[PDB]
RNA sequence: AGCACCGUAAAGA
C-alpha cells in the first residue's frame, strides 16, 4: 500500500535473502507438492472423488490416480467408473500424497505406491496443521505396539 | 531410374496444399399461406453495422457491398 | 552382493538367446502364442525377430542387441498392437526429437491411435501409445502423473546413447523409478556386456529378462582404403569377414611413397555406379567447402530438378516472403538441384528435414553429413565414405572409435536394391596393422554408465518420502557394474586366507560409491537455503525443482536477490541466453551498460555459489563455472525480441544459425519454467514479464513446424 | 586435420 509493505496476518515475519513472508500460527492446510496427507471423502462424482482436508477448498482425487487391486494396471474404463463407488465408499479415509496444486487453490492428489491408499480401522485425530514439524517419514511404526 | 514421386512422401500435408406416397387428395397440393416472423421478407433493411466518414473503413466497404 | 542367475537357451544358429532371472527361481521356458497374432507381417520373420515376439507375447521384458537394418523395429510394433489389444497403454522413448517425429508419423499411419510429447509440441496425449523423449518420462516418474498407473509396456530406442556423460543419467534414473509390475523392451546396438545389463534389470525389478544378440546382417559390406593420391582402392576385408592385410600393406607402402581429392573419389564412385553415397566428415566447414568444390557436377536430369523445385516450394511456403530470401536457402537450392546435399548441426531444421526426405527418395546421391544420420534415421544407402578418421569429442582430438565407425557403416546396404554395400576410408597418416585392425574389425566398446549426481535429482528426491538418493546410487549401473571388478582384491584376500585390504574391501563389497559428492551437494543446499538440517526441503527447493533446463541454484538466487524485479521484459531473456548458450565464438561482443550491468550481478552471485561449493570441496573451479555461461548472444536476443528480421540477426555474430535456434528454443522452455517458478513463490508481475518475453520471441521460423508432422 | 600466434630466408619497387 502506497509504496509500503504492510502485514496482513498475525505472526512472526521471516526474511529470506530478499523475500519477506509471514508464518502465521493458525491456518488451514495450503497445498504443497510432495506433502503426504490424510483425507476423509465427501463425494463421488462421475469422474473422480471429492475429499475433505483442512484446506480452503475440496481436495480432488482423480479416478486415474487411485491404485488398482494388486498391480492389475491396464487403463481406466467405465467398469472402473462404476466400481468407483463400491470400493471407496463415501466417508472413507485415504492416506495419499499431493500430486499438484491448481491455480484455483485446490489440490489434486494421488497414490504413488501401495504403502498409500485406503486405511484400515484404526483411530483418528484432527489438530491444527501448524503443529506438525515439516520433516520426512511421516509414516512411523513405533515400538510401543502401533503406528502413526 | 524414376520419373514420379512416392506415396509415403505424397501423403504429407505441405504437399497436398425410404419411401413415398401419392395422396390424390393432397398430392399436387401446396400451402397457400405460410407463417413468417421475420421483418426482412416483410420489409427491406440496410446492413446493421455502418460508419460515417472514416471510422473503420472496412465497415464502409461492407456498406457498399451489402446495401445493393 | 546382488545374487542373480543367468542362463542360456538351446536355439539355432543365427542369433543367441539368454535369460537373466532371480537367483532363486527355476526356469520354465517360453510358450507358444494363444490365438491370433497381434500383427501379421508381409514377409517371414527371422529367428531373431520371432524369438523377440515369442518373448513379448508371454509378457516378459527383453533386450535386443543387433546391428541396425535388421528389422529391429518389429518387436516395437508387435508390443504396441498387443497393448492396444488388451486396453493397456504403451510408451515409446526416443531421445531425439526428429527421430520421434518420424516414429510418430509411422505409428500414426499404422495404428491411428498415438500421441506425441516433446519439448516443442504435444499431440493426442489420450493415446494408448505415447511417443516422446525420455526426460519427459523422468518428470512423469517423479510427479506420478496419470500414465504410470496405466502404461504396462515401455520400449527404449538407443540405450547405447546412454553411454554418454551428460545424459546417461536419464535412462538409468527412469528405470530405477519404474514399478516392478511393468514390462518393457530395449533396442540397442551390438554390446558385449548384455549379461550385466540383464542381471541389473533383474536385480532391479526382481523380474526375469531376456537377451537377444546377433552379428547377422542382410546386406554385407566391403571395406576399402584410399590413401592420398594413390588413385587406387585397396581391399582390407571382404564380405566373408576375411581380412587380407596384403592389400593393406600395399596401401601403407603407398602412404610411405607419397612422402581436389574427394572430388576425384566421388567421380570414381559415380563412374562405378556406386551411387548413392554418404559422406561422413567430422566438421561443418569441410562439408560446406566440399559441396562448394563439387558444385560443378550434376547427378540429376532436368525433370528431377523441376520436381525438387516443386517439393522445395511446397515445403518452404510455410514461411514468410523474407525468410525465403535467406542466403542459406538460395545458396543451397542449386546444390539440391544437382543431386548433392549437405547436412550438419548448423542449418535451419526446415532444410534439414527437406534434405532427409529428398535423400529417402533418391533425388540426391552424395550427402555430406557428419554424425546426424549415424543415429536417428533409417535412410540407408549403397556406399559410404569416411573423409577422415580423426574427430573431436569432449576435449580430446581422438581417433575414430570402432563403435562410431560401425554406427556409420551400418548405413551402407539398402535391402533388396543393393546386393552389398561399399565402405571406404580416406587416410593420410601412417597407421600400422594394430590400430587399423582394432579399428575396422575390432569389437564394439562396452556400455559403461556415467551416473553423475545432479541438483535437480537431489531436490526432486527430497520432495518424496519413499525414495532417497542413496537408494538410487545403490540401484544404478555405476554400482552394479562395480561388483564384477570387486573379485580382484577379494580374490587376493581369499588367497591370503593384505589384511588391511581384507577389512576394507570386505566392508566395501556391497557398499556405496560417489557418496562424498552427495554429502557435499547437501552441504551446499543447506548453506544456500535449498534445504535445512534434518535433510528436509525449503521453499528455494520447491522453486528450483520446477527448473530442469539450466543451472537452477543460480536462477533461484537471482530471484531471491531481486534482479528481474527491476529489469525489463527482454533483458531477462538475455540474462537467460547467458545460460542456455554453451558454445564458444571468435569475438566476444561489446555490450551496452543497460544490458551488461545485470550480468555483473549475475557473476557476483555465481562467485558466491563458487565459494560455497569450494567450502565443501566439490573439486570445482571458479573461473570455469563462472565462464560456463556465455553472454555471446545477449545482443542477438535483444534485437530479436525487438521484433527484427532473422537476416538482421544472423550477421551480428560469426555463429551458425541452427545453434541460435537451439539457444532460442531452450530459452523459451526455460521461460515457461521460470513462469511456473514465479507462479510458485507468489509473484505475478515477474511471470507476466516472462510470458511476454515468450510472446515476443515466437514470430516466424525459430518455432516452425516439422515437415514430418 | 584445421585456425591463430611468433621467428626465419628470399623477390620487387
Ligand atoms: N526381416 C525383414 N525382411 C525383409 N524386409 C525387412 C525386414 N525387416 C525390415 N524390412 C524392411 O525394412 C523397411 C524399413 O526398414 P527399417 O525401418 O530401417 O528397419 P529398422 O529395424 O526399423 N531400422 C521395411 O519397410 C521393410 O520393407
Swiss-Prot record, chain A:
Subcellular location, principal: cytoplasm
Q: Which UniProt keywords apply?
A: Cytoplasm, Deafness, Disease variant, Dwarfism, Exosome, Nucleus, Phosphoprotein, Retinitis pigmentosa, RNA-binding, rRNA processing
UniProt key word Nucleus: yes
Annotated localization: Cytoplasm; Nucleus, Nucleolus; Nucleus
Q: Which residues carry this modification: Phosphoserine?
A: 77
GO biological processes: CUT catabolic process; exonucleolytic trimming to generate mature 3'-end of 5.8S rRNA from tricistronic rRNA transcript (SSU-rRNA, 5.8S rRNA, LSU-rRNA); nuclear polyadenylation-dependent rRNA catabolic process; nuclear-transcribed mRNA catabolic process; poly(A)-dependent snoRNA 3'-end processing; positive regulation of cell growth; RNA catabolic process; RNA processing
Residues forming the S1 motif domain are: 32-112
Molecular function, one GO term = RNA binding
For this record, the Gene Ontology CC terms, alphabetical, are:
cytoplasm; cytoplasmic exosome (RNase complex); cytosol; exosome (RNase complex); nuclear exosome (RNase complex); nucleolar exosome (RNase complex); nucleolus; nucleoplasm
Associated disorder? Short stature, hearing loss, retinitis pigmentosa, and distinctive facies: An autosomal recessive disorder characterized by childhood myopia, early onset retinitis pigmentosa, progressive sensorineural hearing loss, hypothyroidism, short stature, brachydactyly, recognisable facial gestalt, premature ageing and mild intellectual disability.
Q: What does this protein do?
A: Non-catalytic component of the RNA exosome complex which has 3'->5' exoribonuclease activity and participates in a multitude of cellular RNA processing and degradation events. In the nucleus, the RNA exosome complex is involved in proper maturation of stable RNA species such as rRNA, snRNA and snoRNA, in the elimination of RNA processing by-products and non-coding 'pervasive' transcripts, such as antisense RNA species and promoter-upstream transcripts (PROMPTs), and of mRNAs with processing defects, thereby limiting or excluding their export to the cytoplasm.
Q: Which organism does this record belong to?
A: Homo sapiens
From Swiss-Prot, chain B:
Could you tell me at which residue positions the Glycyl lysine isopeptide (Lys-Gly) (interchain with G-Cter in SUMO2) crosslink is annotated in this chain? 61
Q: Where in the cell is the protein located?
A: Nucleus, Nucleolus; Cytoplasm
Record's comment on post-translational modification: Phosphorylated in M (mitotic) phase.
Entry's family note = Belongs to the MPP6 family.
Q: What does this protein do?
A: RNA-binding protein that associates with the RNA exosome complex. Involved in the 3'-processing of the 7S pre-RNA to the mature 5.8S rRNA and play a role in recruiting the RNA exosome complex to pre-rRNA; this function may include C1D.
* Subunit text: Associates with the RNA exosome complex, mediated by EXOSC3. Interacts with ARHGAP18. Interacts with exosome cofactors EXOSC10 and MTREX.
Query: What's the protein called, per UniProt?
Result: M-phase phosphoprotein 6
Give the originating organism.
Answer: Homo sapiens (Human)
From Swiss-Prot, chain C:
Does the entry feature the keyword Transmembrane helix, yes or no? Answer: no
Can you tell me which family this protein belongs to?
A: Belongs to the helicase family. SKI2 subfamily.
Q: Annotated motif DEIH box: location in the chain? A: 157-160
Q: Which organism is it from?
A: Homo sapiens
Q: What is its EC number?
A: 3.6.4.13
Return the InterPro entries for the record. DEAD/DEAH_box_helicase_dom, Helicase_ATP-bd, Helicase_C-like, MTR4-like_stalk, MTR4_beta-barrel, P-loop_NTPase, RNA-DNA_Helicase, SKI2-like
Q: Which residues form the Helicase ATP-binding domain?
A: 53-209
Q: Which domain of life is it from?
A: Eukaryota
GO cellular component terms, alphabetically, are: catalytic step 2 spliceosome; nuclear speck; nucleolus; nucleoplasm; nucleus; TRAMP complex
Q: Where in the cell is it found?
A: Nucleus, Nucleoplasm; Nucleus, Nucleolus; Nucleus; Nucleus speckle
Q: List the keywords (alphabetical).
A: Acetylation, ATP-binding, DNA damage, Helicase, Hydrolase, Isopeptide bond, mRNA processing, mRNA splicing, Nucleotide-binding, Nucleus, Phosphoprotein, rRNA processing, Spliceosome, Ubl conjugation
Q: What is the protein name given in its UniProt record? A: Exosome RNA helicase MTR4
The UniProt entry, under PANTHER family, shows:
ATP-DEPENDENT RNA AND DNA HELICASE, EXOSOME RNA HELICASE MTR4
> Which reaction is the catalytic activity of this chain?
ATP + H2O = ADP + phosphate + H(+)
Amino acid at each position: 500500500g502506497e509504496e509500503k509493505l504492510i502485514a496482513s496476518v498475525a505472526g512472526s515475519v521471516e526474511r529470506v535473502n530478499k523475500l519477506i513472508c509471514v508464518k502465521a500460527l493458525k491456518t488451514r492446510y495450503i497445498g504443497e507438492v510432495g506433502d503426504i496427507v490424510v483425507g476423509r471423502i465427501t463425494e463421488v462424482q462421475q469422474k473422480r472423488w471429492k475429499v475433505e482436508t483442512n484446506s480452503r477448498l475440496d481436495s480432488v482425487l482423480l479416478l486415474s490416480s487411485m491404485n488398482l487391486p494388486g498391480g492389475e494396471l491396464r487403463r481406466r474404463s467405465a467398469e472402473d467408473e462404476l466400481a468407483m463407488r463400491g470400493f471407496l465408499q463415501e466417508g472413507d479415509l485415504i492416506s495419499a500424497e499431493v500430486q499438484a496444486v491448481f491455480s484455483d487453490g485446490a489440490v489434486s492428489l494421488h497414490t504413488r505406491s501401495l504403502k498409500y491408499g485406503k486405511l484400515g480401522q484404526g483411530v483418528l485425530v484432527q489438530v491444527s496443521p501448524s503443529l506438525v514439524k515439516r520433516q520426512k517419514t511421516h509414516f512411523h511404526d513405533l515400538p510401543c505396539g502401533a503406528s502413526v | 531410374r524414376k520419373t514420379r514421386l512416392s506415396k509415403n512422401l505424397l501423403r504429407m500435408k505441405f504437399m497436398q496444399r425410404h419411401w413415398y406416397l401419392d395422396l390424390p387428395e393432397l398430392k399436387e397440393k401446396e400451402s397457400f399461406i405460410i407463417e413468417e416472423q421475420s421483418f426482412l421478407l416483410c420489409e427491406d433493411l440496410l446492413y446493421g453495422r455502418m460508419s460515417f466518414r472514416g471510422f473503420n473503413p472496412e465497415v464502409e466497404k461492407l456498406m457498399l457491398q451489402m446495401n445493393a | 552382493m546382488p545374487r542373480v542367475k543367468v542362463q542360456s537357451v538351446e536355439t539355432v544358429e543365427g542369433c543367441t538367446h539368454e535369460v537373466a532371472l532371480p537367483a532363486e527361481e527355476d526356469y520354465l521356458p517360453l510358450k507358444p502364442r494363444v490365438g491370433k497374432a497381434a500383427k501379421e507381417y508381409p514377409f517371414i520373420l527371422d529367428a531373431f525377430q520371432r524369438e523377440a515376439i515369442q518373448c513379448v507375447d508371454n509378457n516378459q521384458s527383453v533386450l535386443v542387441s543387433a546391428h541396425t537394418s535388421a528389422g529391429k523395429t518389429v518387436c516395437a510394433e508387435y508390443a504396441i498392437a498387443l497393448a492396444l489389444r488388451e486396453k493397456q497403454r504403451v510408451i515409446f522413448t526416443s531421445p531425439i526429437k526428429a527421430l520421434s517425429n518420424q516414429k510418430y508419423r509411422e505409428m500414426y499411419e499404422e495404428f491411428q491411435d498415438v500421441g506425441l510429447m516433446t519439448g516443442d509440441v504435444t499431440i493426442n496425449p489420450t493415446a494408448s501409445c505415447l511417443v516422446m523423449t525420455t526426460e519427459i518420462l523422468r518428470s512423469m516418474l517423479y510427479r506420478g502423473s496419470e500414465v504410470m498407473r496405466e502404461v504396462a509396456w515401455v520400449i527404449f530406442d538407443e540405450i547405447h546413447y546412454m553411454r554418454d556423460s551428460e545424459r546417461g543419467v536419464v535412462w538409468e534414473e527412469t528405470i530405477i523409478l519404474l514399478p516392478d509390475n511393468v514390462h518393457y523392451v530395449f533396442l540397442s546396438a551390438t554390446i558385449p556386456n548384455a549379461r550385466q545389463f540383464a542381471e541389473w534389470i533383474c536385480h532391479l525389478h526382481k523380474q526375469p529378462c531376456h537377451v537377444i544378440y546377433t552379428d547377422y546382417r542382410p546386406t554385407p559390406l566391403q571395406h576399402y582404403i584410399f590413401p592420398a593420391g594413390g588413385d587406387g582402392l585397396h581391399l582390407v576385408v571382404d564380405e566373408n569377414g576375411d581380412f587380407r592385410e596384403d592389400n593393406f600393406n600395399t596401401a601403407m607402402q603407398v602412404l610411405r611413397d607419397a612422402g581436389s581429392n574427394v572430388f576425384k573419389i566421388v567421380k570414381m564412385i559415380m563412374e562405378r555406379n556406386f551411387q548413392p553415397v554418404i559422406i561422413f566428415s567430422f566438421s561443418k566447414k569441410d562439408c560446406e567447402a566440399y559441396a562448394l568444390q563439387m558444385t560443378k557436377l550434376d547427378f540429376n536430369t532436368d525433370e528431377e530438378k523441376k520436381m525438387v523445385e516443386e517439393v522445395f516450394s511446397n515445403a518452404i511456403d510455410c514461411l514468410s516472403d523474407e525468410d525465403k530470401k535467406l542466403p542459406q536457402v538460395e545458396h543451397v537450392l542449386p546444390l539440391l538441384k544437382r543431386g548433392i546435399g549437405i547436412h550438419h548441426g548448423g542449418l535451419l531444421p526446415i532444410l534439414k528435414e527437406t534434405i532427409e526426405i529428398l535423400f529417402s527418395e533418391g533425388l540426391i546421391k552424395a550427402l555430406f553429413a557428419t554424425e546426424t544420420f549415424a543415429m536417428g534415421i533409417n535412410m540407408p544407402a549403397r556406399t559410404v565414405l569416411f573423409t577422415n578418421a580423426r574427430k573431436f569429442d569432449g576435449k580430446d582430438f581422438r581417433w575414430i572409435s570402432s563403435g562410431e565407425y560401425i554406427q556409420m557403416s551400418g548405413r551402407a546396404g539398402r535391402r533388396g536394391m543393393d546386393d552389398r554395400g561399399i565402405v571406404i576410408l580416406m587416410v593420410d597418416e601412417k597407421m600400422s596393422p594394430t590400430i587399423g585392425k582394432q579399428l575396422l574389425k575390432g569389437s564394439a566398446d562396452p556400455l559403461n554408465s556415467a551416473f553423475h549426481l545432479t541438483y535437480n535429482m537431489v531436490l526432486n528426491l527430497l520432495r518424496v518420502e519413499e525414495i532417497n538418493p542413496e537408494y538410487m546410487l545403490e540401484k544404478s549401473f555405476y554400482q552394479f557394474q562395480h561388483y564384477r571388478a570387486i573379485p580382484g582384491v577379494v580374490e587376493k584376500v581369499k588367497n591370503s586366507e593384505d589384511i588391511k585390504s581384507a577389512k576394507r574391501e570386505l566392508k566395501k563389497a556391497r557398499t556405496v560409491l560417489q557418496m562424498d559428492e552427495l554429502k557435499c551437494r547437501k552441504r551446499v543446499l543447506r548453506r544456500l537455503g535449498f534445504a535445512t538440517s534434518s535433510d528436509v526441503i525449503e521453499m528455494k527447493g520447491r522453486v528450483a525443482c520446477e527448473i530442469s533446463s539450466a543451472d537452477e541454484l543460480l536462477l533461484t538466487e537471482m530471484m531471491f536477490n531481486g534482479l528481474f524485479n527491476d529489469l525489463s521484459a527482454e533483458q531477462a531473456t538475455a540474462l537467460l541466453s547467458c545460460f542456455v548458450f554453451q558454445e564458444n565464438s571468435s569475438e566476444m561482443p561489446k555490450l551496452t551498460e543497460q544490458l551488461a550491468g545485470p550480468l555483473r550481478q549475475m557473476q557476483e552471485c555465481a562467485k558466491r555459489i563458487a565459494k560455497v561449493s569450494a567450502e565443501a570441496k566439490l573439486e570445482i573451479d571458479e573461473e570455469t563455472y563462472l565462464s560456463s555461461f556465455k553472454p555471446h548472444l545477449m545482443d542477438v536476443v535483444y534485437t530479436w525480441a525487438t521484433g527484427a528480421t532473422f537476416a538482421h540477426i544472423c550477421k551480428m555474430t560469426d555463429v551458425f544459425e541452427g545453434s541460435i535456434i537451439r539457444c532460442m528454443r531452450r530459452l523459451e522452455e526455460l521461460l515457461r519454467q521460470m513462469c511456473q517458478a514465479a507462479k510458485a513463490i507468489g509473484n505475478t508481475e515477474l511471470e507476466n514479464k516472462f510470458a511476454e518475453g515468450i510472446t515476443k520471441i515466437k514470430r516466424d521460423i525459430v518455432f516452425a513446424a516439422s515437415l514430418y508432422l
